[PDB]
Every structure is written in structure tokens, then in C-alpha cells.
């Protein structure tokens, strides 16, 4: 009656609407996660270099997962600038630079973009538009030894460091009669040690710090891309390798070539897809739908 927009209906058959089966139990299927960059090598490393000679590592061509690092809760400081601790999983970048070093308690504040300080100016200067994260965790049981761990060194005298600049040439600094490269008046040593003690408090205890920066300009490393289980014989919203569709998956007798992922029927419509997890071929058929006539 609403379809004909009248309160009287003549004898006959009328097409009113279309019954469609709503999809249920949506599934996402992504390939096996078996290629992870050695984040443990950066973190779990037995020894760390000095802050003026911080360890530099490249990260690319993996399937990274930052959720485990965030949920570890073993890090005293986890500060991300330009990104959030969450939502970092599903982002891709061309490459990642990892800078590892060891600092003291008060040095944590100085390791930040836009923050002034002697160390932030002569040891490690962060760019103003820095995008990435900084992770600092206490290492009183590893980087602190009875009697003084003086293995970690920081520049003390310097005439300014550009962002992400490495300066291994730290010749004797002249403060103004020149000493001609000899220790003496008007020229002091450029380096100075920390001397971490077990007796030192939280403000002077050693802290292992790793800075991760993401650079993008094709992306090489991406996130875990978590997947779900496989369900058949039901109208399902499926996502196979970024191909999103709706329909029921059934066992198919078609044999795919090893290099072919999904098949298309006549007129470029998807007909069968191979799930990357187990290399199984499934025919996709639209679930039941059709017109509804009123007699």
C-alpha cells in the first residue's frame, strides 16, 4: 500500500522491496607474520656505547609490532612525539633509525626536541620537527658497578651540534695563548665521565635510552596486520590482503598458480581467492538476495 502510495490495492502482483542477507562474522585474513626486525638486539643488548658515540641502527623490511614494547611496562619513560603510544601498530614508514645510549637521571629531560641544555647542544640535538619515540629504562643492576661505572662518557666542552649529527672527532677544545694541542691553560678536556654508583639516587642512576625515528618519502616495514579465523557456509564480510568483499566462501575445485592470489570471473568480478595463511582456494559467491513480491 505504501509502495503504490494508495489505500486501495488492485488484484495483481507488485514488487515492493529486495530481501538481502546481512553479512555476519566479518573476517580479516593477512599473511603469516614471520619477519620481525631485531628490536631485542637494540633493547636486550648486553652493552651500550657512550652518549657521544651512540649506537646507530637501521630498521626496515620486517613486520614490526610495537604493542609488546608498550605493554612490557619495564620502561620508566615512554615519550612519543608526532605519534601516540597507541595507533602506532598500523602505520608504515620507509625506514627507522634507532639510536641507543646511556644517560643519567637529570639527563632524561634534556633528551627531547626543543629542550635546551649542554648535553642537548653538544652531545645529541633533536630536530625541531622530530617524529618518533624515546624509551628510557633504569639499568642500576647492569650499567652500575660498585666503585663507579665510568664507561659512559659525555662531551663537556664544545664550540653546537646539528640534529642527528655524529661527531667522532673531538680534538682538544681551545678556550682562547693557545696551548697547541697540549693539555694546559686556556684549554680543558672535551669529555667527562658519569661515574654511576649503586649509592647514587634516582637522579643520578644510569638509564638506558633508545630513540626511534621514522622516515618516510615505498614503505618497507609495516605493522603486525593481525588476522582472524576462517568461517565458511555463511554470508561473511571478508578482507583478503586488502581486497574487501561480501559473500559466502565455499570449497572450490579451481587450481590456482603459485604466483596468483585471487581469481576474477568474466567482466572483472572476483570469483575465488586464496588465503595467504594456508594457501587454500575458496570460491566467493554472493549470499542469497532477491526481490520480494506481494500477491
Partner 1 sequence: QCVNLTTRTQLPPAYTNSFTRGVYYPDKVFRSSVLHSTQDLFLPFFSNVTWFHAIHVTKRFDNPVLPFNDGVYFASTEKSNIIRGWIFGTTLDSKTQSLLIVNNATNVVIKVCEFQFCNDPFLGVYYHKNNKSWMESEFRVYSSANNCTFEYVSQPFLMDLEGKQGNFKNLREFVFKNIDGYFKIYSKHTPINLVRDLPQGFSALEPLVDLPIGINITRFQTLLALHRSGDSSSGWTAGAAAYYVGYLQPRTFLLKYNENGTITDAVDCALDPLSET
Ligand X SMILES: *[C@@H]1O[C@H](CO)[C@@H](O)[C@H](O)[C@H]1NC(C)=O
Give the residues lining the site for ligand X (CB under 6 A): 32, 39-40, 43-44, 69, 72, 277-279
* Partner whose footprint covers residue 277, from ligand X, a copy of itself, partner 1, none (CB < 5 to 8 Å by kind): ligand X
Q: Name the residue nearer to a copy of itself (CB basis): 89 or 200.
A: 89
Nearer to ligand X, 69 or 249 (CB): 69
Contact between 58 and partner 1 by CB under 8 A: the answer reads yes
Collapsing DSSP to helix, strand or coil, 258 comes out as coil
Considering the complex, state which of residue 69 and residue 282 has its C-beta at the smaller distance from ligand X.
Answer: 69
Give DSSP secondary structure letters for 119-130.
HHHHT-PPPTT-
Angstrom distance (rounded) from CA 277 to CA 160: 52
Nearest-approach distance from CB 76 to a copy of itself, in angstroms: 11
d(CA 49, CA 36): 24
Q: For residue 16, what are the CA distances in angstroms to 8, 106, 265, 286?
A: 15, 74, 31, 22
The residues, ordered by sequence, that sit 6+ positions from 194 with a Cβ below 8 Å of its Cβ are 104, 149, 150, 152, 153, 154, 206
Q: Which is nearer to partner 1, 238 or 262 (CB)?
A: 262
Strand-pair category, 235-240 with 27-29: parallel
Element at 81 (helix H, strand E): strand 77-81
Among residues 73 and 217, whose Cβ is nearest to a copy of itself?
73
Q: Which is nearer to ligand X, 88 or 248 (CB)?
A: 88
CB 108 within 8 A of CB 75: no
Does residue 1 belong to the site contacting partner 1 (CB under 8 A)? Answer: no
Q: How far is the CB of 21 from a copy of itself (least distance, A)?
A: 29
**Residue span binding partner 1 (CB under 8 A) among the ranges 56-64, 120-128, 173-181, 190-198:** 56-64
Distance CA 163, CA 97 (A): 13
Closest CA to 187 of 175, 202, 204, 196: 175
**Among ligand X, partner 1, a copy of itself, none, residue 176 binds (CB under 5-8 Å by kind):** a copy of itself
Contact pattern from residue 250 through residue 279 relative to partner 1, giving x for each residue in contact according to CB under 8 A and a dash for the rest: ----xxxx-xxxxxx-x-----x-------
Would you tell me which residues interact with partner 1 (CB under 8 A)? 58, 60-61, 94, 217-220, 254-257, 259-264, 266, 272
Amino acid at each position: 500500500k505504501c509502495t503504490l502510495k494508495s489505500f486501495t490495492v488492485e488484484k495483481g502482483i507488485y514488487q515492493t522491496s529486495n530481501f538481502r542477507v546481512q553479512p555476519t562474522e566479518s573476517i580479516v585474513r593477512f599473511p603469516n607474520i614471520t619477519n620481525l626486525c631485531p628490536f631485542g638486539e637494540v633493547f636486550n643488548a648486553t652493552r651500550f656505547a657512550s652518549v657521544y658515540a651512540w649506537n646507530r641502527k637501521r630498521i626496515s623490511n620486517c613486520v614490526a609490532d610495537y604493542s609488546v614494547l608498550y605493554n612490557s611496562a619495564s620502561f620508566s619513560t615512554f615519550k612519543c612525539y608526532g605519534v601516540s603510544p597507541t595507533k602506532l601498530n598500523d602505520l608504515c614508514f620507509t625506514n627507522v633509525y634507532a639510536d641507543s645510549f646511556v644517560i643519567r637521571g637529570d639527563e632524561v629531560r634534556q633528551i627531547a626536541p626543543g629542550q635546551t641544555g649542554k648535553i642537548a647542544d653538544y652531545n645529541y640535538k633533536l630536530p625541531d620537527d622530530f617524529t618518533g619515540c624515546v624509551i628510557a629504562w633504569n639499568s642500576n643492576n647492569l650499567d652500575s658497578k660498585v666503585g663507579g661505572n665510568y664507561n659512559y662518557l659525555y662531551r663537556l666542552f664544545r664550540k653546537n651540534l646539528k640534529p642527528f649529527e655524529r661527531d667522532i672527532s673531538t680534538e682538544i677544545y681551545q678556550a682562547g695563548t693557545p696551548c697547541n694541542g697540549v693539555e694546559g691553560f686556556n684549554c680543558y678536556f672535551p669529555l667527562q665521565s658519569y661515574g654511576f654508583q649503586p649509592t647514587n639516587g634516582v637522579g643520578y642512576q644510569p638509564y638506558r635510552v633508545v630513540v626511534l625515528s621514522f622516515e618516510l618519502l615505498p614503505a618497507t616495514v609495516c605493522g603486525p596486520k593481525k588476522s582472524t579465523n576462517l568461517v565458511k557456509n555463511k554470508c561473511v564480510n571478508f578482507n583478503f590482503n586488502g581486497l574487501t568483499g561480501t559473500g559466502v566462501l565455499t570449497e572450490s575445485n579451481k587450481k590456482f598458480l603459485p604466483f596468483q592470489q585471487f581469481g576474477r570471473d568474466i567482466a572483472d568480478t572476483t570469483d575465488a581467492v586464496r588465503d595467504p595463511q594456508t594457501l587454500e582456494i575458496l570460491d566467493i559467491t554472493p549470499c542469497s538476495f532477491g526481490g520480494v513480491s506481494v500477491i
